[PDB]
Design a binder for this molecule. Structure first.
Ligand SMILES: *[C@@H]1O[C@H](CO)[C@@H](O)[C@H](O)[C@H]1NC(C)=O
Ligand SMILES: *[C@@H]1O[C@H](CO)[C@@H](O)[C@H](O)[C@H]1NC(C)=O
Ligand SMILES: *[C@@H]1O[C@H](CO)[C@@H](O)[C@H](O)[C@H]1NC(C)=O
Ligand SMILES: *[C@@H]1O[C@H](CO)[C@@H](O)[C@H](O)[C@H]1NC(C)=O
Ligand SMILES: *[C@@H]1O[C@H](CO)[C@@H](O)[C@H](O)[C@H]1NC(C)=O
Ligand SMILES: *[C@@H]1O[C@H](CO)[C@@H](O)[C@H](O)[C@H]1NC(C)=O
Ligand SMILES: *[C@@H]1O[C@H](CO)[C@@H](O)[C@H](O)[C@H]1NC(C)=O
Ligand SMILES: *[C@@H]1O[C@H](CO)[C@@H](O)[C@H](O)[C@H]1NC(C)=O
Ligand SMILES: *[C@@H]1O[C@H](CO)[C@@H](O)[C@H](O)[C@H]1NC(C)=O
Ligand SMILES: *[C@@H]1O[C@H](CO)[C@@H](O)[C@H](O)[C@H]1NC(C)=O
Ligand SMILES: *[C@@H]1O[C@H](CO)[C@@H](O)[C@H](O)[C@H]1NC(C)=O
Ligand SMILES: *[C@@H]1O[C@H](CO)[C@@H](O)[C@H](O)[C@H]1NC(C)=O
Ligand SMILES: *[C@@H]1O[C@H](CO)[C@@H](O)[C@H](O)[C@H]1NC(C)=O
Ligand SMILES: *[C@@H]1O[C@H](CO)[C@@H](O)[C@H](O)[C@H]1NC(C)=O
Ligand SMILES: *[C@@H]1O[C@H](CO)[C@@H](O)[C@H](O)[C@H]1NC(C)=O
Ligand SMILES: *[C@@H]1O[C@H](CO)[C@@H](O)[C@H](O)[C@H]1NC(C)=O
Ligand SMILES: *[C@@H]1O[C@H](CO)[C@@H](O)[C@H](O)[C@H]1NC(C)=O
Ligand SMILES: *[C@@H]1O[C@H](CO)[C@@H](O)[C@H](O)[C@H]1NC(C)=O
Ligand SMILES: *[C@H]1O[C@H](CO)[C@@H](O)[C@H](O)[C@H]1NC(C)=O
Ligand SMILES: *[C@H]1O[C@H](CO)[C@@H](O)[C@H](O)[C@H]1NC(C)=O
Ligand SMILES: *[C@H]1O[C@H](CO)[C@@H](O)[C@H](O)[C@H]1NC(C)=O
Ligand SMILES: *[C@H]1O[C@H](CO)[C@@H](O)[C@H](O)[C@H]1NC(C)=O
Ligand SMILES: *[C@H]1O[C@H](CO)[C@@H](O)[C@H](O)[C@H]1NC(C)=O
Ligand SMILES: *[C@H]1O[C@H](CO)[C@@H](O)[C@H](O)[C@H]1NC(C)=O
Ligand SMILES: *[C@H]1O[C@H](CO)[C@@H](O)[C@H](O)[C@H]1NC(C)=O
Ligand SMILES: *[C@H]1O[C@H](CO)[C@@H](O)[C@H](O)[C@H]1NC(C)=O
Ligand SMILES: *[C@H]1O[C@H](CO)[C@@H](O)[C@H](O)[C@H]1NC(C)=O
Ligand SMILES: *[C@H]1O[C@H](CO)[C@@H](O)[C@H](O)[C@H]1NC(C)=O
Ligand SMILES: *[C@H]1O[C@H](CO)[C@@H](O)[C@H](O)[C@H]1NC(C)=O
Ligand SMILES: *[C@H]1O[C@H](CO)[C@@H](O)[C@H](O)[C@H]1NC(C)=O
Ligand SMILES: [Ca+2]
Ligand SMILES: [Ca+2]
Ligand SMILES: [Ca+2]
Ligand SMILES: [Ca+2]
Ligand SMILES: [Ca+2]
Ligand SMILES: [Ca+2]
Ligand SMILES: [Ca+2]
Ligand SMILES: [Ca+2]
Ligand SMILES: [Ca+2]
Ligand SMILES: [Ca+2]
Ligand SMILES: [Ca+2]
Ligand SMILES: [Ca+2]
Ligand SMILES: [Ca+2]
Ligand SMILES: [Ca+2]
Ligand SMILES: [Ca+2]
Ligand SMILES: [Ca+2]
Ligand SMILES: [Ca+2]
Ligand SMILES: [Ca+2]
Ligand SMILES: [Ca+2]
Ligand SMILES: [Ca+2]
Ligand SMILES: [Ca+2]
Ligand SMILES: [Ca+2]
Ligand SMILES: [Ca+2]
Ligand SMILES: [Ca+2]
Lengths: 540, 540
């Protein structure tokens, strides 16, 4: 058909109501009276009564103002019946479009936006982002397009133009330079959005930016030069602690100190760090020792764990140390294999005039010499002059003496001012003299009767050679009660044989030898005889 | 509903016909085939067939070109029935608006406009007014708004820009200066009107302006100096006529002449004007007279009835007159009570030597003296010398003479060259002489007998005093036939009485008187007597 165009109507209209929109006519009215009515939402349906028609003229009206924001369009159905009561025309659809008007102010997405950036970054860096909206049209008008802006950053210091915002997108960026967490950490700037691309109505928001941290700062010592005293030897011990103040953020690696000495003399120092006021705690690496050095001039520089965000001054601490003195024990010089001395020494004679030395050249402390180790008592010391003399009777020949030795240990004490011990061994070579003289091996025989065979006997000397070289056998009172002497060819033994057919048991034979001579006297080597033929038998 | 918008269509469209306008669909076609038709003016109604629809597709078309000027809009009704034959949708109204196109040239209201203005008016004066129209739109386009103009005034002289026209209203006004009915009275200018405020199409008209008249001109004489001759006395008469030429419009007061003399000597001149060539007709106010003046130098200026529309030169006419001569009658000087003359004058004696005078000093014309009035013939005149002598017998005493007078009139005639009369009266004092003498009153008595009483008688003189002073009575032959004389005391009468006793009737008495003397003789005063006693009785 020839339909009927949609009807545009403005919003928030205002004048004298009613307002005729249009007029409709059924031509089938030649016959009876026609009754015009109309139906739909806004008609008889909810919102009832916005539009109504004059049953007799065919006029359509808007009865009151409208807000497209509420309902932006309506569709209606129109009718025409006869007085008799019958419909005449197939109904007719009707449309109305509600044209937008700038009745709406915009509104920010949130009531407050927050942001953050680091202090050392470069100009032209994107920080935050902000939103807002207008409910009016924005597809055929500007009643709903906004334009963003900024008008007041607080801390109007260092300067007041650190940022800008993209008018269309509302994004903010760092424009200037001079950000420092250490002086001004959080800005509060006021934003506004406007109707018709900055032309219409405006509103406010608030965005707040916190500033991350940077290693803008270096560490600073609170003393620059310290001093402490120290002892030579127990040690590995705490000398002095140090103080400092970095200014970036505390629990952070831009706040933790790292040290080191420049030069470690004997490399006898270690230094650690501590999460207190991360003071510098210095200590001794390997004890000290001395009388060698009293002075210690060393320097320690301090850094952070992480590198610096800028060239900065490295700052050292210069420190002086002094070693207190402890006084140590003295010592005999050697451990003496000294005196190759003979057995004939006169009880009270100079053996070893000895001396001991003591470390501490503070030496105005003497000591006393004491002896100590010990198989039995011979020797003697002058305690205030360390003089070892030889008292007593010695005898290389016999008991304690093991290999050609006699080892003895002695002491010495550090007095004068405190304490001390000195353990020193002393081996002294004893010597030989020909003391003893020759002696027979077996002392009792068992001779036989009829024809006894030679009674083997031998010789032994306690002395050391030559002193036991060859012999000379001799038979004293009974050199004839019949007894005849004899030597083995290979030196050592002697052959003892009677020369008479003598008696039934129990009787001695006086013996007498010599080796350089010395002559011993020996003696009786008794002789038990019991009935027989010729071989030395078990007796009775 | 969701109707269907009006359809705009251009006018004088042109391309390949048909032209689809729009397509309609009934959705109730799920069931049968639907048949699309359409109705109305331009459809099935007159203009039939401008639009038609394709029963099966639902397309609407314009079949041929259109002229909004003919029909600027159409309304149509669309239908849709089922094959079975039933309608499905309530019909649908359809509208088409025909948009204007500049197909129309404008046209002047009239084929020729006329106008008129007066020559002396000022620049910036509204004269005519002109109209014209275009039939195309003029409420949303310029297809129908005109712009007026002018492009050719004829008589491109004095200059060619006497006027302008208001482009929007088409009114014309005088812009320049130099209008003269007398040289260029009617302009013919060509006008044009145009489409789109002078932009589109144009056409022509014609406006013609006549120029009213003004008193631009003054009157001019055709002679500047005239002359005429004239006679002394019959008069009030036409001397000379005058000619002139004003140049404005003829039957008009800017063409009628008005005159006047500058100086009217004795105020004896009048001059009128005449609707001929309104010549100046001069005449004589009160006759002239003379021998007093021959010359007349006078001037007459000429104006118009209505003042002048500009300073102009007043132009006079200087004129000379000459008076011809007529010769008049002579006159005795006075009218004479002249001659106190006596009665004794000698017949033929000088009474009044008189003279008369005649006007015209051209005097070489004499006259003749004649007498004329008349009781009887005494006097006489010398006609060629006017001398009145006295012939005859006169007599103061008696007949014609009334009071002491005698009046006579005489004449004199102007000859020599033409004609003349002179009536002059003449009274002449006559005088007294003592002519007559005394005389008795009654001449006949009636006396009585016995004793007659005195017969009274009296006296009378024809003379004038002293000449009749007192008397002297005398009785002649019968101074005694008995008669005795007597005078009255108071002079006049006389007492007559007998002295004898005398006779019976019929007889006279001779009487005789005197007054200076003169002596009269009188006479007989007869006396009739009849019988009696004493009183004068009636007789017998
Ligand atoms: C930003 O927020 C802080 C915290 O309240 C406030 O003190 C400051 O004034 C605001 N503006 C700036 C530029 O710091
Ligand atoms: C020396 O060492 C001591 C240790 O107690 C310290 O207090 C002092 O500051 C250091 N410097 C000097 C000059 O004494
Ligand atoms: C670190 O020590 C320096 C030296 O006096 C001082 O100026 C600074 O304030 C200290 N740091 C802090 C956080 O106090
Ligand atoms: C202190 O500094 C030294 C030197 O680098 C380092 O070895 C040590 O680990 C540090 N102490 C601490 C607790 O970090
Ligand atoms: C530390 O060493 C320096 C370098 O010679 C010296 O001046 C200072 O006296 C020493 N000790 C102290 C107490 O500073
Ligand atoms: C000698 O030195 C040895 C070796 O240590 C030791 O066993 C002995 O007791 C010391 N004295 C003697 C008498 O041998
Ligand atoms: C010296 O050392 C000895 C070791 O035999 C010890 O018994 C003694 O106590 C020390 N003497 C002193 C005075 O400290
Ligand atoms: C020295 O005396 C000390 C103290 O008893 C002892 O420990 C040590 O064994 C002794 N010997 C030597 C050779 O120092
Ligand atoms: C040997 O025997 C004799 C005889 O009785 C006896 O006197 C002696 O003591 C024994 N031994 C020695 C070495 O004399
Ligand atoms: C005006 O009309 C007269 C009369 O026909 C004509 O003679 C004349 O040429 C026209 N134009 C002017 C300027 O007189
Ligand atoms: C004189 O008057 C006569 C009258 O007939 C006239 O014709 C003439 O122009 C006038 N002027 C002169 C100088 O004659
Ligand atoms: C009027 O008289 C003057 C004088 O000759 C002449 O120039 C003028 O043309 C006359 N007027 C007319 C209409 O002829
Ligand atoms: C001619 O002029 C005289 C002088 O004003 C005037 O009185 C007279 O009426 C005029 N004649 C006519 C016919 O207008
Ligand atoms: C008119 O009067 C003038 C003025 O004196 C004179 O010149 C003239 O002759 C007179 N008559 C005539 C004929 O112009
Ligand atoms: C005299 O004059 C008178 C007065 O007019 C006149 O009547 C009379 O006729 C004249 N003549 C005489 C004789 O009186
Ligand atoms: C003169 O006047 C007389 C009047 O009495 C008249 O009769 C006569 O005609 C006149 N004479 C002449 C010559 O005109
Ligand atoms: C003079 O004569 C004339 C001509 O008849 C007459 O009319 C008139 O009366 C006479 N008388 C006088 C006094 O002029
Ligand atoms: C008087 O009478 C006488 C007598 O008859 C007579 O003759 C006479 O004529 C009369 N009158 C006069 C005047 O004489
Ligand atoms: C020093 O002592 C610390 C504590 O035991 C140890 O961990 C470190 O290895 C030593 N040396 C150094 C150079 O720190
Ligand atoms: C000082 O030395 C440290 C390393 O010990 C270094 O990191 C720092 O950059 C140095 N100072 C300067 C100004 O380069
Ligand atoms: C510490 O002090 C000493 C002496 O003044 C100097 O040699 C050393 O360089 C100093 N360290 C610093 C960082 O100044
Ligand atoms: C530490 O500081 C001292 C003195 O200021 C300087 O001479 C030395 O070079 C510094 N050490 C380092 C490693 O920077
Ligand atoms: C004594 O000192 C010596 C060094 O000559 C050593 O060999 C020996 O072991 C020491 N003996 C003791 C018990 O100290
Ligand atoms: C005695 O001398 C030997 C040879 O020098 C030696 O090796 C040994 O130790 C010493 N003492 C003993 C009991 O062998
Ligand atoms: C002159 O004669 C005319 C004609 O009768 C008259 O109307 C007018 O009043 C007279 N006087 C003047 C000054 O025109
Ligand atoms: C000449 O006189 C007339 C009146 O007689 C007057 O209207 C005219 O304006 C005068 N001429 C001039 C140039 O004024
Ligand atoms: C007419 O002519 C006479 C003599 O020339 C002169 O006096 C008079 O002014 C003239 N009038 C005019 C208008 O020239
Ligand atoms: C008429 O013209 C004469 C001469 O041109 C002039 O002298 C006179 O003033 C004029 N008269 C008037 C009334 O203008
Ligand atoms: C004659 O003239 C006289 C003037 O003296 C006049 O009184 C009288 O009327 C005249 N008589 C006649 C008839 O003219
Ligand atoms: C005569 O004289 C008288 C007086 O002067 C005069 O008045 C009269 O007119 C004269 N005539 C008559 C008839 O009275
Ligand atoms: Ca709204
Ligand atoms: Ca809106
Ligand atoms: Ca808005
Ligand atoms: Ca910083
Ligand atoms: Ca730092
Ligand atoms: Ca920092
Ligand atoms: Ca030491
Ligand atoms: Ca020491
Ligand atoms: Ca010591
Ligand atoms: Ca020995
Ligand atoms: Ca020995
Ligand atoms: Ca020996
Ligand atoms: Ca047309
Ligand atoms: Ca048109
Ligand atoms: Ca047009
Ligand atoms: Ca003119
Ligand atoms: Ca004029
Ligand atoms: Ca004129
Ligand atoms: Ca005269
Ligand atoms: Ca004359
Ligand atoms: Ca005359
Ligand atoms: Ca007389
Ligand atoms: Ca007389
Ligand atoms: Ca007389």
């Amino acid at each position: 058909d020839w339909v009927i165009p949609p009807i545009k109507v403005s919003e928030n209209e205002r004048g004298p109501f009613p307002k005729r929109l249009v007029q409709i006519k059924s031509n089938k009215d030649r016959f009876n009276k026609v009754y015009y009515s109309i139906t739909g939402q806004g008609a008889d349906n909810p919102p009832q009564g916005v539009f109504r028609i004059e049953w007799e003229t065919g006029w359509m009206l808007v009865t009151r103002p409208l807000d497209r924001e509420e309902y932006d369009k309506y569709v209606l159905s129109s009718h025409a019946v006869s007085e008799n009561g019958s419909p005449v025309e197939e109904p007719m659809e009707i449309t109305i479009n509600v044209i937008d008007q700038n009745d709406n102010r915009p509104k920010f997405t949130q009531d407050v936006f927050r942001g953050s950036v680091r202090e050392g970054v470069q100009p032209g860096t994107q920080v935050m982002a902000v939103s807002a909206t207008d409910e009016d049209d924005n597809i055929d008008s500007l009643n709903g397009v906004l334009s963003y802006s900024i008008l007041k950053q607080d801390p109007e210091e260092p300067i007041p133009n650190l940022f800008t915002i993209n008018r269309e997108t509302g994004v903010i960026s760092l424009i200037g330079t001079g950000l420092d967490r250490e002086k001004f950490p959080e800005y509060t700037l006021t934003v506004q959005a406007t109707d018709l691309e900055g032309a219409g109505l405006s509103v406010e928001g608030k965005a707040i930016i916190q500033i991350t941290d940077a290693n803008d700062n270096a560490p600073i010592f609170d003393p620059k030069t310290y001093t402490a005293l120290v002892p030579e030897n127990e040690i590995g011990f705490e000398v002095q602690r140090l103080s400092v103040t970095d200014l970036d953020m505390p629990g952070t690696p831009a706040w933790q100190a790292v040290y080191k000495i420049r030069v470690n003399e004997g490399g006898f120092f270690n230094i650690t760090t501590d999460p207190e006021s991360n003071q510098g705690i210095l200590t001794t690496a390997k004890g000290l020792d001395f009388e060698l050095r009293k002075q210690y001039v060393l320097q320690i520089t301090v850094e952070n764990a992480e590198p610096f965000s800028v060239p900065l001054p490295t700052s050292t601490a210069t420190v002086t140390v002094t070693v207190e003195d402890v006084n140590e024990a003295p010592f005999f010089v050697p451990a003496v294999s000294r005196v190759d001395v003979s057995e004939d020494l006169s009880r009270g004679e100079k053996i070893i005039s000895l001396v001991a030395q003591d470390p501490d050249k503070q030496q105005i402390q003497k000591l006393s010499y004491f002896i100590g180790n010990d198989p039995a008592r011979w020797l003697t010391v002058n305690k205030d002059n360390g003089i070892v003399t030889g008292n007593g009777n010695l005898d290389r020949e016999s008991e304690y003496v093991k290999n050609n030795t006699y080892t003895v240990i002695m002491l010495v004490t550090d007095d004068g001012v405190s304490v001390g011990t000195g353990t020193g061994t002393l081996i002294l070579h004893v010597l030989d003299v020909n003391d003893n003289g020759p002696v027979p091996s077996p002392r009792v025989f068992t001779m036989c009767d009829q024809n006894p065979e030679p009674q083997v006997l031998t010789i032994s000397d306690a002395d050391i050679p030559p002193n036991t070289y060859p012999y000379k056998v001799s038979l004293s009172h009974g050199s004839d009660l019949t007894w005849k002497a004899e030597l083995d060819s290979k030196g050592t033994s002697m052959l003892l044989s009677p020369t008479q057919q003598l008696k039934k048991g129990d009787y001695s034979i006086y013996v007498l030898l010599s080796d350089a001579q010395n002559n011993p006297q020996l003696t009786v080597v008794n002789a038990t005889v019991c009935s027989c033929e010729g071989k030395a038998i078990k007796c009775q």
